[PDB]
Every structure is written in structure tokens, then in C-alpha cells.
Amino acid sequence: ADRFNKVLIIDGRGHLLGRLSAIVAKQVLLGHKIVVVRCEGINISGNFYRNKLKYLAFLRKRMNTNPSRGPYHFRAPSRIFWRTVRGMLPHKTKRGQAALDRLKVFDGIPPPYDKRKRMVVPAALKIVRLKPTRKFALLGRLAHEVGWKYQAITATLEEKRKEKAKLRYSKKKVEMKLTKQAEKNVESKIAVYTDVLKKYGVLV
């Protein structure tokens, strides 16, 4: 990307919580619409027991006199990521509240976005920002063990989504093999046009 997209759809799998939230919160302040899918695929650095204790310590932050007013401990990985981004926004102002409106978080890839291209932020990936010997905690498992009740259905609809996307990619490879076969059959019919692309480095 890096093109001032109309709607930037980022995949959450393999990304770090605060590493992605820091970049997402800056995009929504610049007027960009961000959609983070598969928030259960986000992973947090540190072993699972550490990050779970941090959320369990957050669960205890209820208001003593009336917990219905206190901190709303959201259990879904989407709303967990949504609040992590909210912590990096001036959400109590008008420009910060309008920033949260530009962010849409989803557990898994819903039908509005399963037929879209998901982006990846390499400055927030676990494979890039973490050493291979460090432990990390998946936000899907962390959420399930603090009160998320929709982990099995999200995993069921995701495998249903991958089997459907795998069927198309097989058809897309067949269409690409016929495309590369077409280029060899009309090689003498497009040689005048390839040389224009070869001359200016468009084709190697």
C-alpha cells in the first residue's frame, strides 16, 4: 500500500498488539479508514501466562461502588484490539472520537472483506519484531480464557472461509497457466510490444 488508500484492510494474524495499534492509531488520525480483520490472530510478546495475568489484573479494575459504570472489560479479540487502539487515541476529543469511527475491527474475515486483499504491516509482525526464542501469546487463546464465547464458531467459519478461498486460488492458477500459455502462442504477435516494455525496464 503506502498510497493513501480509501479503505486499508489489514490482516491481524502474525501482528503484535501495540506494534499494530501504534500504526493503526496514526492512520485513523490522518483520515484513513482502517479495517483490521482476524484480531484473534494477533499475538502479544511474552509468554501466555504473563499476558493472561495482565488481562486478569485488568478484569479486577471494576468500580467498587458500581461496576456497571466501571471499566468495560471487552473479551472479544476485536474489541480488545479496539481498546488498545483507543488507548493510543485522544478518544475524549472530537478528532479522536472521529478517529475510532474510521477503524473497524473484526474477529475473522467477514464476507464484506473475505473477497478483498488483506495488507500486512512488516513493522508490527511477530516474525520481524520478536526474536525466534522469545515467547508470545495469541490473542485468540488469551480472549477465550478470559470470557470470549465465540472462538469455536469463529474457527469454524474461518476454515469454511479458507476452503472456499482455496477453491478459487486453484481456479486462479489455472487461469494464470492459460495466460502464460497464451503469451507463448502470441509471442511473435506481441514481439513489437514486448520490446517497448523491454526497452524501458517494464519487463526484465
Binding site: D2, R3, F4, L29, L30, R95
Partner: protein
């Protein structure tokens, strides 16, 4: 289209002091301080639409208005630039589109 996309990211400021006479712009594909040299001096434009119609130079009157400016210098090392406009940009434009014209051309 003959203008590059920019974003009004905010005014030139510290942390607890805001200087509205200078605006900070976010260019589209410019993320180094060395790549802003092309845009230094280009005329900026905040095109917006109001309720009442206004005069349009070279056309029929519409409800389109504009606040002209210019990219003055670079800001930081991440392609951000400073811009000064004829009138200070309204704070409602923070995060909106700013037109960076290709003139004054130096190429």
C-alpha cells in the same frame, strides 16, 4: 488530475503550545526528508464546499471555496512538510485532503 495528495495532519506545535500560522502536511508517497525537495515552494490548496455560493474564477459560481498556501520547508525526517496558507487552516480540516499543485515548477 494535476495535484498530488496531501493530508492536513495538524499545526506546527510543541506539546502544550500550538502555532496555527504554520500547518503540517502529510504527502502521499513522501516519507524521507530528502524526497520533499521537489515539493518545496509548491502552492497548496484546501478545497472545500460551503452553503452559500461564491464566485469562481474562470467558471460559473458554485459552493466551492479554497484556502491557498505553499509548502515552506521540511518537517522532521518522515516526509512531513510545513505549509503556510493565506488564512490559518480550520481545525476541522485535520486529516482531510490538501492539494499540492505542480507549480511553481522547477523541473
Amino acid at each position: 488530475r494535476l495535484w498530488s495528495k496531501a493530508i492536513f495532519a495538524g499545526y506546527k506545535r510543541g506539546l502544550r503550545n500550538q502555532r496555527e500560522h504554520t500547518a503540517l502536511l502529510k504527502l502521499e508517497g513522501v516519507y524521507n526528508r530528502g524526497e520533499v525537495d521537489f515539493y518545496l515552494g509548491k502552492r497548496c490548496a484546501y478545497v472545500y464546499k460551503a452553503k452559500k455560493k461564491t464566485a469562481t474564477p474562470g467558471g460559473k459560481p458554485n459552493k466551492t471555496r479554497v484556502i491557498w498556501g505553499k509548502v515552506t520547508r521540511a518537517h522532521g525526517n518522515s516526509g512531513m512538510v510545513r505549509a503556510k496558507f493565506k488564512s490559518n487552516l480550520p481545525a476541522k480540516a485535520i486529516g482531510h485532503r490538501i492539494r499540492v499543485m505542480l507549480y511553481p515548477s522547477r523541473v
